[PDB]
Subunit: 141 residues, 4 copies
Amino acid sequence: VVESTVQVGPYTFEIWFDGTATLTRYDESLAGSTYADIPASVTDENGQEYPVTVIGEKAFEETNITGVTVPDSVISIGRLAFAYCNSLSDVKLSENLIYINELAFASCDALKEITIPASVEKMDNPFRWSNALDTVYMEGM
Amino acid sequence: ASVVESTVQVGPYTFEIWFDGTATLTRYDESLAGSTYADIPASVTDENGQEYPVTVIGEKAFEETNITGVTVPDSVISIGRLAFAYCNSLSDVKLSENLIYINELAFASCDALKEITIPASVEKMDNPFRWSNALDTVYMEGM
Amino acid sequence: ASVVESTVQVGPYTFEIWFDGTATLTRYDESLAGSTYADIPASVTDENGQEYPVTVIGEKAFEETNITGVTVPDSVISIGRLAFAYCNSLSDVKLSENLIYINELAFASCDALKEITIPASVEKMDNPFRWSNALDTVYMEGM
Amino acid sequence: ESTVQVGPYTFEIWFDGTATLTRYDESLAGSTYADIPASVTDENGQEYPVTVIGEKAFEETNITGVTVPDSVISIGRLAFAYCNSLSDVKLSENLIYINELAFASCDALKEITIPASVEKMDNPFRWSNALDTVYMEG
Ligand SMILES: [Mg+2]
Ligand SMILES: [Mg+2]
Ligand SMILES: [Mg+2]
């Protein structure tokens, strides 16, 4: 169950009963740049800190981002999280990511390269994401 | 970077042994196989009894064959271009730790292939699953 | 270039009426439907009783719905972006005989769609079937 | 006798009086433009319409453009597969069937026009990573 919704600049987060946060929406009209440096934590109205463990379903859908850092607090990237981000060319994934859900980078056709962290256990076939993604690299543990 | 020293036939498998001391699986001949499961040998012996590791699955080695399953042994470092392409009955692929490279379209248009597990040793993949309809999910082996 | 005159609800269907005298189907609400077959009306009546043709299936109108089949009536000229995307039970699509354009990803990631018949009137399609990997064959009436 | 060579083109001639283009040999071609002949003649001067582009006929060749003449009824499986420089395909007009992966990995192909005669084809969006739009001629 959602405990509260917190807005941090262009980011909307939902805080759950289990003490984790999901990044539910990126609002490009509120962003200071096209590089999304996603925070690893979010603080509620009472000063309690929660880790950002999930990039929610369609959170960045159809946004103008050119680059993104997914912090090491994130365990899962949701379905269509970065779908139709037509200018997205630089994706930094971090060691602790376990799951990359279906079509997480659907039609990110400016994405030419991606490196998968050693921690990833299950992902959607990454070659479905971008028409320009010829090769996928895997980080060694 | 090398030259073929000898060609060896082991049942349905053709191997080329290179002067660098490694062997490439160049062809799978269906008509000589005992079953549709390809249990690829990790090594091949030449006419003088010398043993060589099978380090590469050659380009198109299993192209359009009737295989239902395959074990790629721990001796293999790379899987060549279209090595298992258009294998419409292939549903079970065992990759082993030591594989580094999966070349372009290596498992292309394999319509019965629904999943694959990638070993922790794999460093690079050139779109090996293009046109393989049911290949949604990729699992990754931990170290 | 037009403006929305009014919005009309007809069972599970939401329509926008434009000043050019046409209607766009903007949303399909699963919870208001009597069945999983979407028999889209060819016309819609506004609050003053005026009938208008349904000429467009709007962007994402049926996105992620439970529909198993759809009839796109002969009044429809264009199917919008992602109009039927992610409809994983959709297997039967009857398209409009006046359909001219099928916009980008209109039938994307529809994993149960195995075939489609394209009407002779269609002039242009912007990759409508991306990620619908069971969609092998496309039929046309021909000569 | 049942095989005819016309420059870079090999044709197999059938009992039913039709011909299949079985192979394109780029080392024998005068250019990278494959203007496929609509007919082929045997040693006795009998003319055979070219009705089929055979399976893998142009596989991995250097062609930059192709005209498939109005005599062709079917394009075979992987006929133009891995033709990495192919950017212009003219289909004519009598074509009925386009078999599986006829233009597989023809990733320099940005648009294609499908003739009104085509009745059944492999999804053309599978062929090229650069093919955003398919046009249908009336
Ligand atoms: Mg197939
Ligand atoms: Mg790994
Ligand atoms: Mg799917």
